[PDB]
């Protein structure tokens, strides 16, 4: 194979700033103890691409998670806060758009490259949290 535009996301990333993440977790429904422990985490995110399959790993003191997926194709995901969700990830003009559905609820996670950073925007019903990652 050759290069994919998605290769811009590939690499090892470390969290360097977080805003409104506690309120985002509140809106998602995360319980108190998990919110407090998850809110302290400074995860490393490892993104790789192999053919049509994109893999995103998150490693932290709170939880280690991994998803592998093909763009546009729905998959099952167990989130770090232990929700069992149906996820679909697409590419929209350079932005990975990740929709999670569960319990009749929905949240959208957008991952984008900005300068040398990987910016993650987590949105739930009017509440947005911004998570900024730098190369590890």
Ligand X SMILES: O=C(O)c1ccccc1Nc1ccccc1-c1ccccc1
Shortest Å distance, C-beta 13 to ligand X: 9
Is 132 annotated for ligand binding? yes
Considering the complex, state which of residue 4 and residue 60 has its C-beta at the smaller distance from ligand X: 60
| 19, 25, 83, 106 from 31: Cα distances, Å | 19, 8, 11, 17
Binding site for ligand X (CB under 6 A): 15, 25, 38, 41, 43, 58, 60, 62-63, 79-81, 109, 120, 131
Q: Are 127 and 24 in contact (CB under 8 A)?
A: yes
Is 111 annotated for ligand binding? no
CA atoms of 135 and 101, how far apart (whole Å): 30
Considering the complex, state which of residue 12 and residue 60 has its C-beta at the smaller distance from ligand X: 60
Considering the complex, state which of residue 49 and residue 119 has its C-beta at the smaller distance from ligand X: 119
Residues 6+ apart with CB under 8 A from 35: 22, 25, 26
Is 24 annotated for ligand binding? no
Considering the complex, state which of residue 3 and residue 67 has its C-beta at the smaller distance from ligand X: 67
Shortest Å distance, C-beta 60 to ligand X: 4
Binding site, annotated residues for a fatty acid:
131-133
């Amino acid at each position: 194979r050759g290069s994919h535009m998605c290769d811009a996301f590939v690499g090892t990333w470390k969290l360097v700033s977080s805003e409104n993440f506690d309120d985002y977790m509140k809106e998602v429904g995360v319980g108190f103890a998990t919110r407090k422990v998850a809110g302290m985490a400074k995860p490393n995110m490892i993104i790789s691409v192999n053919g049509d399959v994109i893999t995103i790993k998150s490693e932290s003191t709170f939880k280690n998670t991994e998803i592998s997926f093909i763009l546009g194709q729905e998959f099952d995901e167990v989130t770090a806060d232990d929700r069992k969700v149906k996820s679909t990830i697409t590419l929209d003009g350079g932005v990975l758009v990740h929709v999670q559905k569960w319990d009749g609820k929905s949240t959208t996670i957008k991952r984008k490259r900005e300068d040398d950073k990987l910016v993650v925007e987590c949105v739930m019903k009017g509440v947005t949290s911004t998570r900024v990652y730098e190369r590890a």
